[PDB]
Design a protein around this ligand. Structure first.
Ligand SMILES: C=CC[C@@H]1/C=C(\C)C[C@H](C)C[C@H](OC)[C@H]2O[C@@](O)(C(=O)C(=O)N3CCCC[C@H]3C(=O)O[C@H](/C(C)=C/[C@@H]3CC[C@@H](O)[C@H](OC)C3)[C@H](C)[C@@H](O)CC1=O)[C@H](C)C[C@@H]2OC
Length: 113
């Protein structure tokens, strides 16, 4: 596991084309599962049967996603461990994430665009 910006950790699980990497502003199609540090699952889009899309690195998602995702190539599966300051910090999210939580994200880069 690699320690990227802000102390976010990447655990590579299954490779991508090792060549198609998301660039700033690129639209990404991802499948994620979010868990707290205890393993307690709080969200998943796989459960929704619909992948998430956002433009990467422009402030649309929490910073751990912004620093994290661009280091993945199309088709890869990896796990992002994100500390509070790079996620929801001291505020959290009502009914999902408590103040100061470290978030674990299992994500799959389906397509870059
Ligand atoms: C108003 C319209 C609702 C709009 C909802 C959608 C488009 C649907 C989309 C599937 C979101 C999920 O809803 C099904 C749901 O995703 C979580 O469950 C989740 O796993 C998560 O953490 N995600 C989602 C995947 C990207 C990383 C992170 C994120 O960065 O998400 C972003 C996030 C909340 C950023 C805040 C931005 C404000 C800053 O202040 C804060 O700064 C700390 C960080 C999302 C993408 C916002 O851009 C847009 C929205 O919120 C949140 C725990 C609760 C959130 O509910 C909404």
């Amino acid at each position: 596991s690699e320690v990227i910006e802000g102390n976010v950790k990447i655990d590579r699980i299954s490779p991508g084309d090792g060549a198609t990497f998301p660039k700033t502003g690129d639209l990404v199609t991802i499948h994620y599962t979010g868990t707290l540090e205890n393993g307690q699952k709080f969200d998943s889009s796989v459960d929704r049967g619909s992948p998430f899309q956002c433009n990467i690195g422009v402030g649309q998602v929490i910073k751990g996603w912004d620093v994290g995702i661009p280091k993945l190539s199309v088709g890869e599966k990896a796990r992002l461990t994100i500390p509070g300051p790079y996620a929801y910090g001291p505020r959290g999210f009502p009914g999902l994430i408590p103040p100061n939580s470290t978030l674990v994200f299992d994500v799959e880069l389906l397509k870059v665009n």
